[PDB]
Paper text:
Value of the data• These data describe the molecular packing in the atomic structure of a reference antibody Fab fragment, with implications for crystal growth and structure determination. • The structure includes the complicating features of twinning and pseudosymmetry; these are described graphically and measured. • The data provide evidence for the structural basis of the observed twinning.
The structure contains four independent but similar copies of the complete Fab fragment. Pairwise root-mean-square deviations (RMSD, over C-alpha atoms) among the four Fabs range between 0.05 nm and 0.09 nm. The first 4 listed contacts, with areas of about 20 nm2 (the PISA-provided Table uses units of Å2, so the listed area values are about 2000) are the biological light-heavy interfaces within the 4 Fab molecules designated LH, MV, AB and EF. Thus the largest contacts produce vertical columns of successive asymmetric units. These are known as periodic bond chains (PBC's). Although the calculated energies of these similar interfaces imply that contact 2 is energetically preferred, its repetition (without contact 3) distorts the PBC and produces a nonintegral, underwound helix (not shown) incompatible with a regular lattice. This provides an explanation for the observed pseudosymmetry: it weakens the PBC, but converts its helical pitch to an integer value (n = 4), thus enabling a regular lattice.
Numbering used by the authors:
A (entry chain L): 1 to 213
B (entry chain H): 1 to 223
Write the structure that this text describes.
């Protein structure tokens, strides 16, 4: 079957930078097509018939190539171009998609704002306690969060989740959630989320004492 | 406009059959040259084409899955069905229907996708807890508040604030499968602290697989 590779797999570039994504097919096809997929969305037709812009696509995007080698070009990369891009052949059965290229925006360093939430009294009645630490609007993505409970460093009871890069300001947000039983939670006083990041010259700690307003 | 919408169960057990329906409007599948196709996408993997059907009832299948797939049309109801037999964990994915034409041989209009999980585990509705703003969820002149959406199965869940009227500074985190085997996520909103009184905050949570719909008020705590 006609199969395609895509290069690179991941690309990071600044706003205004020229971006190039290539697709190489296992044998010659008459046209290549391109899709743009934002996280949690259906793919959208971006380029059809190798070089033609689909409806609503800005002039910024262009496609070229022939035979087995095809190129998607973004002349001046914009924050809203954060997506995964796929090539697609429909020249012969089976129809096939390339492996995808994820484009992320390189931005200047921004420090996270750090926020802590004790468990609600409603969760505590239902028998569990979740402590949530929020890091908001920061860059780059890489960030260390450590939980301390009565000055003991926690392991294996906290999970992280990170937003997809923001389509206007190119920053990330992160949640770190510490989970304990109600019994373990009520045994301890000091709950502290400690945050290390490039944009902070020293680690930042937000903490609360269990039971206070 | 040309529109398509996928429907089917959120959850199927291993070895069972999946039935998906694509309902379309703004075009007819009796019109010469018209096709509807099925495409899937495993969590964070590449798009994979599965099947298509044409106005003349010609069918095509992806050769790796051919033994397991059946595509069918009902012109009279503007519907295309895909049956996938003997579902296994590799079939967990978002399933898309899309329109193709004989003039194109590319998918120009897509549905929004339907999420399917192949699992032994039972459906479970979320518990919804407020993440109340306080001094501790304040950084500079910014306040944060939110909702913790805990212990549901399967994916997906939807979260909006004030029925979708509040949209800026909203961050809904992707779900994490917990060690317990149930999903959890938070959704948070940021606002300037001195701007908080501009509205009340309600997170509307909807888990369509368990038919659960919760509204939760998120207010500051008192003493």
């Amino acid at each position: 079957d006609i199969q395609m590779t895509q290069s690179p797999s991941t690309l990071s570039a600044s706003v205004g930078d020229r971006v190039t994504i290539t697709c190489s097919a296992s044998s010659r096809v008459g046209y290549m097509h391109w899709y743009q997929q934002k996280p949690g969305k259906a793919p959208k037709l971006l380029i059809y018939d190798t070089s033609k812009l689909a409806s609503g696509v800005p002039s910024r995007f262009s496609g070229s190539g022939s035979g087995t080698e095809f190129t998607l070009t973004i002349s001046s990369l914009q924050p809203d171009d954060f997506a995964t891009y796929y090539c697609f052949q429909g020249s012969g059965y089976p129809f096939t998609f390339g492996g995808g290229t994820k484009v992320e925006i390189k931005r200047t360093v921004a420090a996270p704002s750090v926020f802590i939430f004790p468990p609600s009294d409603e969760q505590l009645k239902s028998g569990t306690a979740s402590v949530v630490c929020l890091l908001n609007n920061f860059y780059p993505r890489e960030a260390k969060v450590q939980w301390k409970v009565d000055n003991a460093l926690q392991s294996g009871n906290s999970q992280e989740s990170v937003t997809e890069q923001d389509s206007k300001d190119s920053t990330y947000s992160l949640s770190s959630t510490l989970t304990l039983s109600k019994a373990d939670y009520e045994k301890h006083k000091v709950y502290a989320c400690e945050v290390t990041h490039q944009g902070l010259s020293s680690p930042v700690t937000k903490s609360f004492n269990r039971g206070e307003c | 406009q040309v529109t398509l919408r996928e429907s089917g169960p959120a959850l199927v057990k291993p070895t069972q059959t999946l039935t998906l329906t694509c309902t379309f409007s703004g075009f007819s599948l009796s019109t010469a040259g018209m096709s509807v196709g099925w495409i899937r996408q495993p969590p964070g993997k590449a798009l994979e084409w599965l099947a298509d059907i044409w106005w003349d009832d010609k069918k095509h299948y992806n050769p790796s899955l051919k033994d397991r797939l059946t595509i069918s049309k009902d012109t009279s109801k503007n519907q295309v069905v895909l049956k996938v037999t003997n579902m296994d964990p590799a079939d967990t994915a978002t399933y898309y229907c899309a329109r193709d034409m004989i003039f194109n041989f590319y998918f120009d209009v897509w549905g929004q996708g339907t999420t399917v999980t192949v699992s032994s585990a039972s459906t479970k509705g979320p518990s919804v807890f407020p993440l109340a703003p306080s001094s501790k969820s304040t950084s500079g002149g910014t306040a944060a508040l939110g909702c913790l959406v805990k212990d549901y199965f399967p994916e997906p869940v939807t979260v909006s604030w004030n029925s979708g009227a509040l949209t800026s500074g909203v961050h809904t985190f992707p779900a994490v499968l917990q060690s317990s085997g149930l999903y959890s996520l938070s959704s948070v909103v940021t606002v300037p602290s001195s701007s908080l009184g501009t509205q009340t905050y309600i997170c509307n949570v909807n888990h369509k697989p368990s038919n659960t719909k919760v509204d939760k008020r998120v207010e500051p705590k008192s003493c």
